[PDB]
Curated annotation (Swiss-Prot), chains A, B, C:
Ranges of residues in domain Alphavirus-like MT: 27-258
Oligomeric and partner information: Homododecamer. The enzyme forms a membrane-associated dodecameric ring with a central channel for the exchange of between the viral replication factories and the host cytoplasm. Interacts with non-structural protein 3. Interacts with RNA-directed RNA polymerase nsP4. Interacts with protease nsP2. Interacts with itself. Interacts with host STING1; this interaction results in inhibition of cGAS-STING signaling and increased levels of palmitoylation and protein stabilization of nsP1. Interacts with host TMEM45B; this interaction leads to viral replication inhibition.
Residues of the full protein shown: 2 to 473 of 2474
PTM (free text): Palmitoylated by host palmitoyltransferases ZDHHC2 and ZDHHC19. Palmitoylation is increased by the interacton with host STING1.
Annotated function: Cytoplasmic capping enzyme that catalyzes two virus-specific reactions: methyltransferase and guanylyltransferase. mRNA-capping is necessary since all viral RNAs are synthesized in the cytoplasm, and host capping enzymes are restricted to the nucleus. The enzymatic reaction involves a covalent link between 7-methyl-GMP and nsP1, whereas eukaryotic capping enzymes form a covalent complex only with GMP.
Binding site for Zn(2+): 78, 128, 133, 140
Membrane topology label: Lipid-anchor
Domains as described in the record: The N-terminus binds a zinc ion which stabilizes this region. The C-terminus is disordered.
Location in or out of the cell: Host cytoplasmic vesicle membrane; Host cell membrane; Host cell projection, Host filopodium
Name used for this protein in its record: mRNA-capping enzyme nsP1
Length: 451, 451, 451
C-alpha cells in the first residue's frame, strides 16, 4: 500500500513528490547518503505508475535496459542490451551476481528461466530469448505491444518509434529531464531541485556558473594570437552533472524528443501518432505516446509547454579563461516567490535592491537554492525596465510603421510566469528512416559468476 | 446522492461549482494531477444536469461523440463518429478496450448489444445501428428527439440545426466556452479560472501575453525588407491552450454559435426557434435550444449577454519578433475586486499606483491570478481618465453639433461591470443550407481488440 | 548493532559522522586524549561499511597493511608488507606482541594459523602464506578478487591497478584526503575539521599560515646576495601535519589518484574501468573502482567534484624569512555560513567589516575554527568586488572583440558555492606500466616475541 523512497524524512522535496503522485502513499526511508537521491526517487515512482496503468499478460520491450532493476518484477520484460557505453559491463556483472544470489529463496519469479536465457545468450551471441538479447533498437526481432524508454538520450526519436511501430507496438513511455531549455538554445543552465547543472563545452573555464573551474592570475594585456574567434554561439556537445555523476550529450538528439501534439510517420507502412505530458515535477517529466495504423486528420507542427513554476532565460557577463564575454543562462523559480514579487516589479528596481528583497523572502530553511539568487536578481531588474519603455512608446492600433526599414528592439530577458504556455514550431511529417560486440574474457567471467 | 469530481479538496473553485449547481451535492475526490481539472469537472456536472432534465425512453443523438464516456449510462445514445481528427483512432481503440474488459461483470447495460453493433459496423462501414455509426452530422439517417453537442467547435450552427430539425429533433444542448470575446474581435485573451489562454496566429512571437515565445537580441536598425506590412488586424485562424493541450480554431465557426434570442429557419420545411443560457460559470456556459414547426412572430436580430463578473477589453503595447506594436486583449475579473475599486476610480490614478492597490487587495491565497494584474492595472487607469474628460466637455440636451463634419473621440478601454449587459446585432433569418474514411489495418486492430 | 568511536560526547563532529553513515548507530566512548581523533573515527567507520558491502569467502589483499588492525576480523585478509618506512618495524613488533597475548583466550579466529605463517615467513623471507608476505604491490603473487588501499599515498595509481587486475581483482577501494586542492595547484592549505594543515617546503618560514615558524628581527636593508630568486612557484615536495604527526608527500603521486569517471588500461591484457565517490565528509573521501576485461565505449577525460560545503582559493600576502611576498592558499567553509552571507555580498564590503560580520555569525561554541577567519574575510571581499566590475563592462551577445590582441583580466579569488561542481581534464588512456630488506636482529627479536 505505501511506497518507500530513500530520502531524508526532513526534506522539503517530499511535499512536491506527494503532490505529483496523489494516487500513492509515499513514505521516506533513508539508507544511503546518495547525492542524487531526488532523481532516483522520481524515477522509481514513475515506473510504479506505468506498471499500474497497463495490463498483465502484455510483453514489454525495455530499450537500453539495466536488467538488475527489473529482476524482482512480476511483469514480462524483454531487455534490449547492446554494449555501447563504458558503464554497461559492470551492470551486466551486477545482474549475474544478483541472479546467482537469489536462486532458491525466491520462487515467485522466473529466476530459473532468467538464468537459462542468460546462459543461452552467452553461448551464442545472436539469439533472441524471452527475457534478454544483445541487439540495438533497430535490429531486435522480438514482437510486443508496449515499449519503455527510461533515461535514454542517445537515439533519434522518430526512427526509433517507426521501428517499434512496424513490430506491433501501440503504446510507449519516455521518462527524463524536460527538453524546453534546449529549444530556447541556452548556453548553460540548472535544474536546482535535483542538484543538477549543465554547460556547453566552450564555457567550461568560466567563473560564476554552476559547472566550471578557473585559475588565479594578475592579468596580461598581450595574449597575442592571430586567430579570430570573434563569435561565440552554442555548438552540439554538452556536459551534464547529476550530483557528482558526469554524462556527455548531443543537442540534436535532445531536441528530437520535443515532439508535437500530433504527427505522421509515412513509410512503407503508415501511422498516426499523438504525444502528451502526464507527469511534470520541477523539471522532470513523463511522456506517453500512442500509435495507430493509417493516416487521419491534419497536423500543424506546434509543441506546447505548460509552466507550473516560473521559467527564466537571461543574458549574463563573465570571464572565460580570463577574457570578459556575455552569453545566455536559464533556470526555474518556485511559484510562491514569483507571486510575492508582483508588486515590486511595477517600478524600476536596481539589481542590488532586488537581491536584498529576494534574500528577505527566501530565509525563513530556504525555499530556493542560494547560489542562483544573484543571476535571478539581475534578470528581474532588466525585465521591469523593458516593460516601462514599452508603455512609454505607444503605437496606433492596427498599423505598422515601416518607413523602407523597421527597427528591432533590445531583449535581454525572457520570463514565463506561472500559468502561461510556451509554443514552438517543429517538424511533424517524417518520411526518411549488426555485430556482436561482446568479448571472450567477459563471457567467461559471466559464465563463472552464474555457476 | 453526491456527485464526485477529481479536484483538490483545498481548491477555491469548488465554491463556484457549488454556486452554479445548487441542486447537487458536490464532493471532491482527487485521483490524478491533471492540469486542466476544472474544465473536466464542469463538463461532468453539465451532463449530469442535462440527463436529469429529460425523460427516459427518449433516444439521444451524440454529435461528434467520444463513445467511451457514454458506456456506463442507462439512457439510449446513438453516437455519431466520423473520423476527421488525429485524436479519433485512439478514442475508438479505448472504446473497444473498455468494452472487452467489462463484458460479464456488468449486466445492467446493453454491453452485448454494444459489442454486436461495433462488430457489425466494422464488417460493413455503411450501416446504421442503434448505438453507433460512422457518418457526419448532415448524413446520419437515425431519427430522434434530442441532440447534444459537447465541446464541438467545428460546424456551422444553423445548417447543422436545420438538418437535425427535419429529422424530428425538438430540443438541443450546447456546452462550451463563452463566445462573447470573439464578438468584440479581440486579438488575444485568457480564461484564467480554467488555466486557458488563446491567441491569433500573427502574435505568437510576442513577449508578455499568456501564450507566446520569443528570443534574446541586441537590436539592429536595418531589417531592410521591401514588404509593406503597415496593417495588423485579426484573421481567421486562432490557437487555444487548455492546460497543456493545444487546439486550432476558426473565428467564423465560433461566431456562428452566438445566436439571437429568437430566429427563423426557412427551407423546404420551416421552423421557429429560441435560444437561452441556463448555466454560466466564470467563462464556461450551457445553452438550450427548442425548435417548432411553422413560422410565428417576428425577430429583431439582437443577442444579449449578462455579466456576473467583470469583463475587460483594452489596448496594449508589446514587441512581436523584435518590433514594437499595439493590439487589443481581453479578460475576466472577479466581482469582489470590482466592487472594492469603486471609490479609487473617482480620481485620476497612475498605472503604477493601481498595481500596488490591486496587489494589496489580492493577497490575503490569491483571489485572482497574478500574471494578469499588470494589464488590468493599465486598463482601469485609462478608463478613469476617459470618464473625467467626458464630464469636462458637457453638451446641450437633445442636440448634435455637426459643423459639415463631426469628430470621433479616442476609446482605449471597454469595461462591463457586474450586473450590466452586452447587446449585439446578428443575423436572425436563414434560408441557405459521403465516403467511409476508415482503413483495413484499423478495422483489423479493432476486431482483434474485441475478440 | 551500535558502533563505538573514541571521541568526546560533547563534540560537534558526531552530527556530521551520523549524517555521513546513516545505516549505522554511532555512539561516543572516549578513552584517550588523542589529538587526531576525528580522522581515526572516520577511517574506522569506512572499514565497517566496506566489510558490510562485500561477501564472505572472498579473499582480500591489503596493500601496505598494518596487520594488527586486521587481527580481530572474521574475513580473509592477505597483508602485503614491504619494509620501506621508518614506522614499519614498530608496527610489526606490535603485531607479534598482540598475537602472543591472545593465543588461547580467543578461538573464533585463525590465531594459530596466523602465528604459523608469521614464523614461516621469518624462517624464509621469500614465501607467500595465506595471511602475510613481504613483497611490494607489483611483486606479490597471491591471487584474489578485492583490494583495499587505506591511507596509501606513495604509489602511482594506474600501474598499481593494472598489476592487481592481471591477477583477477575486480573491485578496489581507496580511503583518504580529498585530492581537489592539489588539482588547483595551491601553495598551502587546511582541512580544519580534522586539525590538519599542509604546506609547500618553500614557505615553511612564513608567519601567518597554519604550519610555519619564524623569528623576531629589526630589519636590515642590505641582505646582498647575487642569486636571482625572482620566481616563486609550487614544487614537488609537500609536508602534512595531522594533529602532531608529520608526513612528507609528492605532488605527482597525489595527483595520480584524481581519476576520471571512465578509463582504459591497454597492456598485454586490456581492461575498462570506472571510478565514483561513495562517501564524502568535510574533506575525507571513499572511492570505489571496478575493472572489467576487454575494451568498451569511449572516454572523454573529465573528472568532476561535487561541493556540499563551500571551497575557497585566494591570494594572500605574507613575509617569508623576513621578505614580503604573495602566494595562494585554500580552505573549506561550512554551508550555513555561506548561505548567511548571500545578502551582504551584493555590495562592496571592506575586509574589516566582513571580519566583524563573520565573527557575529560564528559565536553562539563556534561553527568554524577562528584561525582561518581573517583569510576568509579577505577572499569574500575580493570576490564581491570582481563581480561588480563584470556587471559594469557589459559585452554584446555572441561576439568576441579581439582588436589583433585581447586582454586578460585579474582574478584573485575562486569560490565554489554549495551545490556546484568542479570539472578538470586529465589523462584517460594508459599504455605504459625484488630484495628482502629484512635484517637478522629484527628477525631474532620477532621470533623471541612469538615464543
Ligand atoms: C543513464 N543516465 C542516468 N541519468 C540520471 O543520473 C542519475 C544516475 O544514474 P546512474 O545510471 O549513473 O545510476 P546507477 O545505476 O549507478 O545507480 P545509483 O547510482 O545507485 O542511482 C539517475 O538518477 C538518472 O536520473 C542520466 N542523465 C543524463 N543526462 N544522461 C544519462 O545518460 C543518464
Ligand atoms: C475536444 N475539445 C476539448 N476541449 C477542452 O479541453 C479539454 C481537453 O479535452 P480532451 O478531449 O483532450 O480530453 P481527453 O478526452 O483526452 O480526456 P482528459 O485528458 O482525461 O480530460 C476538455 O476538458 C475540454 O474542456 C476543447 N477545447 C477546444 N478549444 N477545442 C476542442 O476541440 C476541445
Ligand atoms: C599512514 N598515514 C596516516 N595518516 C593519517 O594520519 C593519522 C595518523 O596515522 P598513524 O599511522 O600515524 O596512526 P597510528 O597507527 O600510530 O595509530 P594512532 O596514533 O593510535 O591513530 C591517521 O589517522 C591517518 O588519517 C596519514 N596522512 C598522510 N598524509 N600520510 C600518511 O602516510 C598517513
Ligand atoms: N541504439 C541503441 N539501442 C538500444 N540501446 C542503446 C542504444 N544506444 C545506446 N543504448 C544504451 O542505452 C543505455 C543508456 S544508460 C542506461 C539507462 C537505463 N535504462 C537505466 O535506467 O539506467 C546504455 O546502456 C546504452 O548501452
Ligand atoms: N461534421 C461533423 N459531424 C460530426 N462530427 C464531427 C464533424 N466534424 C468534426 N466532428 C468531430 O467532432 C469531434 C470534436 S473532439 C470530440 C468532442 C467529444 N464530444 C468530447 O466530449 O470529447 C471530433 O471527434 C470530430 O471527429
Ligand atoms: N610499493 C609499495 N607496495 C606496498 N606497500 C607500500 C609500497 N610503498 C610503500 N608501502 C607501504 O605503505 C604503508 C603506508 S603507512 C601504512 C598505512 C596502513 N594501511 C594504515 O592503515 O595505517 C607503509 O607501511 C609502506 O611500507
Ligand atoms: Mg551511481
Ligand atoms: Mg488529455
Ligand atoms: Mg600515532
Ligand atoms: Zn531482442
Ligand atoms: Zn447515425
Ligand atoms: Zn603476497
Amino acid at each position: 500500500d505505501p511506497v518507500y523512497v530513500d530520502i531524508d524524512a526532513d526534506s522539503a522535496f517530499l511535499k512536491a513528490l506527494q503532490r505529483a503522485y496523489p494516487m500513492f502513499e509515499v513514505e521516506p526511508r533513508q539508507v544511503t547518503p546518495n547525492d542524487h537521491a531526488n532523481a532516483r526517487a522520481f524515477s522509481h515512482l514513475a515506473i510504479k505508475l506505468i506498471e499500474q496503468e497497463i495490463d498483465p499478460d502484455s510483453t514489454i520491450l525495455d530499450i537500453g535496459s539495466a536488467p538488475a532493476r527489473r529482476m524482482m518484477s512480476d511483469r514480462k520484460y524483454h531487455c534490449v542490451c547492446p554494449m555501447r557505453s563504458a558503464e554497461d559491463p559492470e551492470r551486466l556483472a551486477n545482474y549475474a551476481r544478483k541472479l546467482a544470489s537469489a536462486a532458491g529463496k525466491v520462487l515467485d519469479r522466473n529466476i530459473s528461466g532468467k538464468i537459462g536465457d542468460l546462459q543461452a545468450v552467452m553461448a551464442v551471441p545472436d539469439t533472441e530469448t524471452p527475457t534478454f538479447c544483445l541487439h540495438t533498437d533497430v535490429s531486435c526481432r522480438q514482437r510486443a505491444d508496449v515499449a519503455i524508454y527510461q533515461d535514454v538520450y542517445a537515439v533519434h526519436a522518430p526512427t526509433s518509434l517507426y521501428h517499434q511501430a512496424i513490430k506491433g507496438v501501440r503504446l510507449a513511455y519516455w521518462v527524463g529531464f524536460d527538453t524546453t531549455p534546449f529549444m530556447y538554445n541556452a548556453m548553460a543552465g540548472a535544474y536546482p531541485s535535483y542538484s543538477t547543472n549543465w554547460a556547453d563545452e566552450q564555457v567550461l573555464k568560466a567563473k560564476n556558473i554552476g559547472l566550471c573551474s578557473t585559475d588565479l592570475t594578475e592579468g596580461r594585456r598581450g595574449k597575442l594570437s592571430i586567430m579570430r574567434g570573434k563569435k561565440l554561439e552554442p555548438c552540439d556537445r554538452v556536459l551534464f552533472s547529476v550530483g557528482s555523476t558526469l554524462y556527455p550529450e548531443s543537442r540534436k538528439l535532445l531536441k528530437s524528443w520535443h515532439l508535437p501534439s500530433v504527427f505522421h510517420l509515412k513509410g512503407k507502412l503508415s501511422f498516426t501518432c499523438r504525444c502528451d505530458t502526464v507527469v511534470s515535477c520541477e523539471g522532470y517529466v513523463v511522456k506517453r505516446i500512442t500509435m495507430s495504423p493509417g493516416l487521419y486528420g491534419k497536423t500543424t507542427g506546434y509543441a506546447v509547454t505548460h509552466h507550473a513554476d516560473g521559467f527564466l532565460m537571461c543574458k549574463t557577463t563573465d570571464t572565460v579563461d580570463g577574457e570578459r564575454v556575455s552569453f545566455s543562462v536559464c533556470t526555474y523559480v518556485p511559484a510562491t516567490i514569483c507571486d510575492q514579487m508582483t508588486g515590486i516589479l511595477a517600478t524600476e528596481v536596481t539589481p542590488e535592491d532586488a537581491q536584498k528583497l529576494l534574500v528577505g523572502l527566501n530565509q525563513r530553511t530556504n525555499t530556493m537554492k542560494n547560489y542562483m539568487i544573484p543571476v535571478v536578481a539581475q534578470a528581474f531588474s532588466k525585465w521591469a525596465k523593458e516593460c516601462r519603455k514599452d508603455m512609454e512608446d505607444e503605437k496606433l492600433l492596427g498599423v505598422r510603421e515601416r518607413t523602407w526599414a523597421f527597427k528591432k528592439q533590445k531583449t535581454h530577458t525572457v520570463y514565463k510566469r506561472p500559468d502561461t504556455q510556451s509554443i514552438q514550431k517543429v517538424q511533424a511529417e517524417f518520411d526518411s528512416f549488426w555485430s556482436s560486440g561482446l568479448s571472450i574474457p567477459l563471457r567467461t567471467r559471466i559464465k563463472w559468476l552464474l555457476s
